[PDB]
Amino acid sequence: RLPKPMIGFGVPTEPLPAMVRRTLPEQAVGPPFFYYENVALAPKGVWDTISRFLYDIEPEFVDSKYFCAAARKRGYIHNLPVENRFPLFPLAPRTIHEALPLSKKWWPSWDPRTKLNCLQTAIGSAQLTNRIRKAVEDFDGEPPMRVQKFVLDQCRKWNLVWVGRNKVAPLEPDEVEMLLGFPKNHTRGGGISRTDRYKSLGNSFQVDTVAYHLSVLKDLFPGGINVLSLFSGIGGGEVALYRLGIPLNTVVSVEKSEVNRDIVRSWWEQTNQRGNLIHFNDVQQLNGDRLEQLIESFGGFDLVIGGSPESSLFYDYVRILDLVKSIMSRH
């Protein structure tokens, strides 16, 4: 199934695994590079399917805990050079202590969490926190694993952290934004509600992880790149490239969520990007006719990137990848 340590072809912080290199089908190679992500713990044959349609390339499984304080198991399918990768600096917090310095005066002896579980879209009610306190207000103890494993399992699933005496709380949006490697208040703005923030963050790249894989693009494109981002979310791929110091000449972003679109746009404006951000609402309108003239106007895409959301939407990733890949092959 999945590997010893989910370190893919290697992580900066750890000793290399046995297989450090790959050879890949000459269909897979050539312009453009592509990068697809999906949840690692997937149902049967799902990864078989994804692989079959992506040139039978073997997916790279890495846990993002090797890059930050939050664990997150993903598979990545790409034709990127695996050699000469480098980690993204400024370096992200590796532990809860580093990520949340003030949380450690309140941290019980029996909570061994040095890493956070996967960050997700919904969040523990005020009730749960009040309840947990009630459970452990009996003090002087370490009270039995009934109470402990209850609290620990609840803290694990909701990512609850100690912020007071016998008191837990969900991660604030900007604590989440930082564990995922986004700018502070990246998702904050306009009409965006609190729960909208959490939802957008729940489904998004861990920027530090993604940056490590995309780092090999920097030496390859000193003049900048054109990016086609499918299912852009809150711009995780584009932020990784910007933090990597790779100029974004042109970016075509396909993104159905309005909130997600505002977030990316504001980011493009706040960072004072000088390239073009071109947006489309639905992936189903990137037809050949359009792609033809995008590529004609702004040159070919050097990278097409996307993550998994509708389960048939994956086939549109495949459909757009090769439309692009075919158009960019004309002798």
Next chain:
Amino acid sequence: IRLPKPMIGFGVPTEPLPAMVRRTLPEQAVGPPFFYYENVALAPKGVWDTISRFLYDIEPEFVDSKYFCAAARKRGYIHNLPVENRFPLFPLAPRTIHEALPLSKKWWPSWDPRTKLNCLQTAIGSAQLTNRIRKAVEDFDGEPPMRVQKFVLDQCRKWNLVWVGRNKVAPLEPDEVEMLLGFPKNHTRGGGISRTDRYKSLGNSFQVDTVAYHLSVLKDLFPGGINVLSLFSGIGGGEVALYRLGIPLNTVVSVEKSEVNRDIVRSWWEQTNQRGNLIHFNDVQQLNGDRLEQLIESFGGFDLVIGGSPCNESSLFYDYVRILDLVKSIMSR
């Protein structure tokens, strides 16, 4: 749907549309290889939008087989073939019930106005139903109330029942079905193949005369024969069409899950005494870039990729699009 009426596609032998050619295709769509994909005309909502989307936004050719034979059959064909200089397949299939069934005339009630059959199903009328219908008209001098006329007509239209005796209706025989679809006689007949198995594999096969009219433009294009990649090959409707068109089949890679269908095509292959090779796979899934490359390396590359819809699995269509993209990518080097 956005279904045209009359449904004559890009032309039919009786209205071949000279002076009309198909508009220039997107550079992505144009061959080689030529591709040809079939699906039922009355698909559910959005299906054809999707199919067209994934095949270079090409407009499907909607055509009723009633313009080619005696049994109506509404299908959509999406392809990158030239339309100009098509020609009808000969020998010519029967256009009406009377021509298809010369001996049915003597038993045909004056009030049964059918001259054409309905879409050939995979399933068939029950001996009770016929028994009933016969029984139901044991009244003298026929012409009984419309209410009974309307009943039997509806049932005859539903199950494609034909008159075979005095007050006697019967389902079409397998070999009568094979005829209407344009296959050789007893094409599906073979050792061990059940009667029910025959009717089934037939009920969802290409109408050969219709398909041949579309593929006819390939004859002048490939005097030295073609290599064919046939996905969801069934009982070999696409191959039978090309053979009957007089186009030599040098290399055919047929992919078919059913063994009954496999044996039928193989039987045809050697009874026809074909010279070229027929290679069988059973899952589209086992057709990957590696294999496709070694296949093209061995046999020279495909001039035609042909496939029929296996569903109204629904995901199998994406395997067709996948395979088409690989083949197309490989040859383009």
